[PDB]
Amino acid sequence: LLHRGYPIAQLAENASYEEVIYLLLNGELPNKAQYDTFTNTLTNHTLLHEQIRNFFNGFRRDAHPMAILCGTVGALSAFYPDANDIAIPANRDLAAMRLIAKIPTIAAWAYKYTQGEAFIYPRNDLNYAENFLSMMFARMSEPYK
Amino acid sequence: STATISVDGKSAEMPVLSGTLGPDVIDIRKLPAQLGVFTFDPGYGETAACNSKITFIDGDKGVLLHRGYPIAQLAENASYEEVIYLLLNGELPNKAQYDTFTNTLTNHTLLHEQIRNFFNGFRRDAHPMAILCGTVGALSAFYPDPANRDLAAMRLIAKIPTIAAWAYKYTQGEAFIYPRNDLNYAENFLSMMFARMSEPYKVNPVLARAMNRILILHADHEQNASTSTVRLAGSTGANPFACIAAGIAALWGPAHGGANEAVLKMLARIGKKENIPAFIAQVKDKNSGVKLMGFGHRVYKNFDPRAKIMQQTCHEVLTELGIKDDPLLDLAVELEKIALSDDYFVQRKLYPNVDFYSGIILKAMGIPTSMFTVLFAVARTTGWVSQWKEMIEEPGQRISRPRQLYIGAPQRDYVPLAKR
Amino acid sequence: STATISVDGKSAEMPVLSGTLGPDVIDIRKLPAQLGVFTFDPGYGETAACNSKITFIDGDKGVLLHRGYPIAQLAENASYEEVIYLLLNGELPNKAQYDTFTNTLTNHTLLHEQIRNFFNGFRRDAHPMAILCGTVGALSAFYPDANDIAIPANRDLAAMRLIAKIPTIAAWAYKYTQGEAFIYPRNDLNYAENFLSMMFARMSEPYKVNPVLARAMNRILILHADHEQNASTSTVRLAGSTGANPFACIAAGIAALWGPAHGGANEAVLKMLARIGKKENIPAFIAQVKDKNSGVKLMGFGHRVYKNFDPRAKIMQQTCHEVLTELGIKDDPLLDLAVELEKIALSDDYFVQRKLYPNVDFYSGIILKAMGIPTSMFTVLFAVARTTGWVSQWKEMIEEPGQRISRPRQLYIGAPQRDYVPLAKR
Ligand SMILES: CC(C)(COP(=O)(O)OP(=O)(O)OC[C@H]1O[C@@H](n2cnc3c(N)ncnc32)[C@H](O)[C@@H]1OP(=O)(O)O)[C@@H](O)C(=O)NCCC(=O)NCCCC(=O)O
Ligand SMILES: CC(C)(COP(=O)(O)OP(=O)(O)OC[C@H]1O[C@@H](n2cnc3c(N)ncnc32)[C@H](O)[C@@H]1OP(=O)(O)O)[C@@H](O)C(=O)NCCC(=O)NCCCC(=O)O
Ligand SMILES: O=C([O-])CC(=O)C(=O)O
Ligand SMILES: O=C([O-])CC(=O)C(=O)O
DSSP: OEETTEEHHHHHHHOOHHHHHHHHHHSSOOOHHHHHHHHHHHHTTOSOOGGGHHHHTTSOTTOOHHHHHHHHHHHHGGGOGGGGGOOOHHHHHHHHHHHHHHHHHHHHHHHHHHHTOOOOOOOTTSOHHHHHHHHHHOOTTSOOO | OEEEEEETTEEEEEEEEOOSSSOOEEEOTTHHHHHSOEEEOTTOTTEEEEEESSEEEETTTTEEEETTEEHHHHHHHOOHHHHHHHHHHSSOOOHHHHHHHHHHHHTTOSOOGGGHHHHTTSOTTOOHHHHHHHHHHHHGGGOOOOHHHHHHHHHHHHHHHHHHHHHHHHHHTOOOOOOOTTSOHHHHHHHHHHOBTTBOOOOOHHHHHHHHHHHHHHSOOSSOHHHHHHHHHHTTTOOHHHHHHHHHHHHHSTTTTTHHHHHHHHHHHHOSGGGHHHHHHHHHSTTSOOOOTTBOOSSOSSOOHHHHHHHHHHHHHHHHTTOOOOHHHHHHHHHHHHHHTSHHHHHTTOOBOTHHHHHHHHHHTTOOGGGHHHHHHHHHHHHHHHHHHHHHHSTTOOOOOOEEEEOSOOOOOOOOGGGO | OEEEEEETTEEEEEEEEOOSSSOOEEEOTTHHHHHSOEEEOTTOTTEEEEEESSEEEETTTTEEEETTEEHHHHHHHOOHHHHHHHHHHSSOOOHHHHHHHHHHHHTTOSOOTTHHHHHTTSOTTOOHHHHHHHHHHHHGGGOGGGGOOOOHHHHHHHHHHHHHHHHHHHHHHHHHHHTOOOOOOOTTSOHHHHHHHHHHOOTTSOOOOOHHHHHHHHHHHHHHSOOSSOHHHHHHHHHHTTTOOHHHHHHHHHHHHHSTTTTTHHHHHHHHHHHHOSGGGHHHHHHHHHOTTSOOOOTTBOOSSOSSOOHHHHHHHHHHHHHHHHTTOOOOHHHHHHHHHHHHHHTSHHHHHTTOOBOTHHHHHHHHHHTTOOGGGHHHHHHHHHHHHHHHHHHHHHHSTTOOOOOOEEEEOSOOOOOOOOGGGO
């Protein structure tokens, strides 16, 4: 298994998830300037439009998380009508980046919804993997470590 | 040892049972079979309804013990959590047991977020006791399912303060504040009730210590009306969360826990010492309906030991808060003196009870009168679940189902509407 | 006349009171002052807790009367509303009283719209009894003037509001669990018809009330309206004795009724019957029931008072046959099983020696299921009907001259006095 030529074992052992995201999306491993720009863009899109909270309420608390993910991501398409028919290349990148940045937030909120737990927001000081753990497991009663 | 009951020209022996402390009792469980009659005791005041190892009260002597420990020693030295452990389990916890116990409580203080919707079903001007009763009753829906008894008990003790604080916040139009694991039971309740979204809340240690003592003083009181309601509803095998809502309903009555709110309104209406005579005359005016709220007890026929501690605490807290005078407390103390030297009260053995001085302390802590009985309910939830658990785990537990004396119409036939 | 109680050398006379019907009772209100002891009666089965003019039960004879009228006569002839008036007021209503009464009920069937929000606090899989308990408890917030006893007329109004609103709350609870739109009360329908409509009307077509089901509902409500000092009514009286808001007191009654040893037994009975499934499996079940350390019971049998057939169970069985016949159902497997189970139990010494007979909950679920009511709503239906008895009992208790708080004693058998021990020395 190779990703843009790189064996999966080498990437799993040495790369940060974000480096692999950049690799799969763009074709090459990112240098530092590219890496910073890429991750800054992801953090700048992790927050969801608050109206989205209402969509979760359409589900019973015992709904399977995949059903919540499917429907809510589908719903997310409504917030980006310019994506309905894209011609400009920069716009395809932005759509891709918004999906990569928002899916973890939607996923964690889906989990919290099924548990009856308060939604936890993404944190810019946490990387992709750390932020997903925080959003899924932080509680309102103490700081999450 | 037996007692003999004779009626109709027939006698029968009844077992006489003795407790660790307190009066002996006559076992009448076989009375109908033996003599064909029931006892008649509206109010239940002369009927021992159950065995209990939780709390002892000697009403004539003004004694109150929890698992054998005097209330004054627990109020003076124990943390409320130690007292909760004690009432639920039977003994004071060692360090390991205590740490495990407080860990479990903090693990269940958070509410299922859908619960937020319940609060919206109320008008903002709803009395907090109504919010508490309905919301705790509703909570039974989230827990449809021994260690399971312990878990139900712990969930109720851990959650009632959060529900109570959220009810308060709702009435004020304020954002709900979440429980904090770094705060103990008393501190956390103060934080949840008073923290604001505009600044970090700083728990005032003087208030925390006062809260700790108030919770202990209201934790349990043997077979009072609310605990009796919890036991009766629970005897059918009913969900314990629903049983606690039943207890909350009973406690709300002004003859019970509701008396603490009624006391402050009474004192405020009297206004000043010069108005006590007019009030006392109303109380003695047999037919006025007016009672000296915060006085009297079904069991105590002497000073309520909790009232003495409540008064000391009023003095101690006001001093610590730098308050030199509290007109309301001065008024209450004078009213107590006047009633206690009047034959009407002396003859009836009426003395201050736990509710006479509690509102005064609570008000000094910034707690609104609309929340006095709810605070009582938060503390008493510990007693309620301890009593429920003892009742439901007892070998030979049966449903509570009394009899009556029928004094209505004799048998008669139904007449159709056209002929009425 | 008096009774004599002698204990520890001393003797004292106790008044003996007699009722219109039923056993004489020994007034022990001065027992502690006279002999320094209390009676001991866990379960309260041998203690008359109050005077009442509402309902009479002769347990040994299997007789049930409401304000003097036999239950069979009321179930056969009366409308549920007539029985509600009777239990609440003391006499059957004349035409003018009846019309005024029913007009008052229809005038209070609608709920304050903010109440919709409360239902949203429940998960959709919430048991309806929990929704009913919590929501009725919440209703107390809307009637704060009721936190007070004071005026007679205000107690009548609280009772009428509870009787008129419970069916709406119950129906909305059902609709909520089904994900169905709430159906409002209709003034052109009577109490039974309206409940069926609120429970089963759909937004896609007009609802046609089936008279067969309306008559069955009318009977069902009458059969569950009141039953003297049962656990839930006793809970209502205990809570109400403190002066507590009657709406909160009804929530307390609902909590007590939910227990499987009380009203919850009707849901338990149908589940038990379904598990037995076939008559060939009865022996195995009866063996578990007769097994001393198994705790399994023949749900729907036994009673604290009846030591004979429950007159309501006889009418309930008869109603099952009548309803199934009118609906055109030639056979009901579960009814057949229940009848055979009754015969087997009634001819077995375990049950005969204990005087265990079918009670009101043994045949009720069969009728309700035939009416299209789901098992999750059986106890809620019981609660809707019983609210009438609960408020009638509450009203009698609170208006009685000399009413006092209900507060029993106990036999303390715990630890003797001991001094507090610091944490480090435990
Ligand atoms: C607490 C209690 C409900 C006890 O009720 P109960 O055991 O039935 O008292 P009781 O009916 O035997 O009263 C005996 C006599 O004292 C009178 N009495 C009792 N409490 C009285 C009071 N607070 N003020 C004036 N008179 C009172 C009764 O009217 C009766 O007088 P009569 O014989 O002339 O009729 C009652 O004393 C009362 O209503 N007190 C005021 C309300 C209150 O403070 N409740 C809080 C109690 C503690 C709690 O539950 O939190
Ligand atoms: C209805 C009731 C709770 C009455 O309780 P209670 O008055 O305390 O009965 P009890 O404890 O004095 O029982 C006497 C004997 O009959 C037994 N017994 C009672 N009901 C029994 C039943 N349904 N099946 C098997 N045995 C039963 C008891 O075990 C006891 O036997 P032992 O003396 O050998 O131990 C009980 O009969 C019961 O649990 N029945 C099944 C549940 C039920 O149908 N409840 C609905 C009742 C009506 C209602 O409230 O809607
Ligand atoms: O014990 C009683 O009857 C009332 C009481 O003081 C309490 O419940 O605290
Ligand atoms: O009377 C009882 O104890 C229980 C009962 O049958 C009822 O409440 O209908």
